[PDB]
Amino acid sequence: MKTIGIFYATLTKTTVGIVDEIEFFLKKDDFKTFNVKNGVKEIENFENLILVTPTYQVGEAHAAWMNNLKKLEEIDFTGKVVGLVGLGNQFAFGESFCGGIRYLYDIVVKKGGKVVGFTSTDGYHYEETSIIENGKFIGLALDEENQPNLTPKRIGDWITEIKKEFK
Numbered sequence: 001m002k003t004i005g006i007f008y009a010t011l012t013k014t015t016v017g018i019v020d021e022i023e024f025f026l027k028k029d030d031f032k033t034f035n036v037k038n039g040v041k042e043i044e045n046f047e048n049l050i051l052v053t054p055t056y057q058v059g060e061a062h063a064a065w066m067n068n069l070k071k072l073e074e075i076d077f078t079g080k081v082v083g084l085v086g087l088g089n090q091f092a093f094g095e096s097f098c099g100g101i102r103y104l105y106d107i108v109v110k111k112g113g114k115v116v117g118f119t120s121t122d123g124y125h126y127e128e129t130s131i132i133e134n135g136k137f138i139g140l141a142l143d144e145e146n147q148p149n150l151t152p153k154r155i156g157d158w159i160t161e162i163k164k165e166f167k
């Protein structure tokens with residue numbers, strides 16, 4: 001399996017614990033981890049990607065991702081296999097839960113990438129959503145406020161699934 005590039009951002013550090021969990025499930029696999037507050041340049045260097053963002057400002061990604069969306073779109077994603085992870089709060093944001101991964105998704109598929117790791121919408125409460133395609137969420141959706149006890153298995157199952165598609 002080619003080395004996995006893990007890219008995240010965080011405001012209040014919740015995402016740091018989620019990244020640590022991803023890294024734990026990749027304990028036997030080569031990965032490298034980057035905080036996109038330091039830019040997105042290195043996304044170019046990996047064939048396998050895990051892009052992680054908490055949700056801010058009505059369904060947006062963290063500002064460090066938003067500020068780099070033009071740079072991200074400059075990257076050629078052809079032949080890359082990408083899993084997306086959002087963190088959000090589904091009851092406080094009934095219309096924008098984990099909406100940040102939509103900004104990443106649209107760029108990855110536009111630039112030739114393959115997005116993997118769609119997840120079931122069962123077990124979530126939402127009034128509206130912008131992160132569904134084909135009846136599933138376009139990535140892994142985590143809610144540490146309301147469903148922290150589901151996060152470890154949600155991540156472990158997801159990592160098992162996307163590793164089957166990874167190069």
Ligand SMILES: Cc1cc2nc3c(=O)[nH]c(=O)nc-3n(C[C@H](O)[C@H](O)[C@H](O)COP(=O)(O)O)c2cc1C
Nearest residue numbers: 010011012013014015054055059088089093097098
């Ligand atoms: C100002 C603010 C806006 C937020 N907006 C959303 C949102 O639109 N959708 C969502 O699902 N969660 C939203 N959240 C919840 C966060 O995404 C969630 O608490 C996450 O765990 C924060 O991760 P972090 O500690 O790594 O920054 C918001 C939180 C704050 C403080």
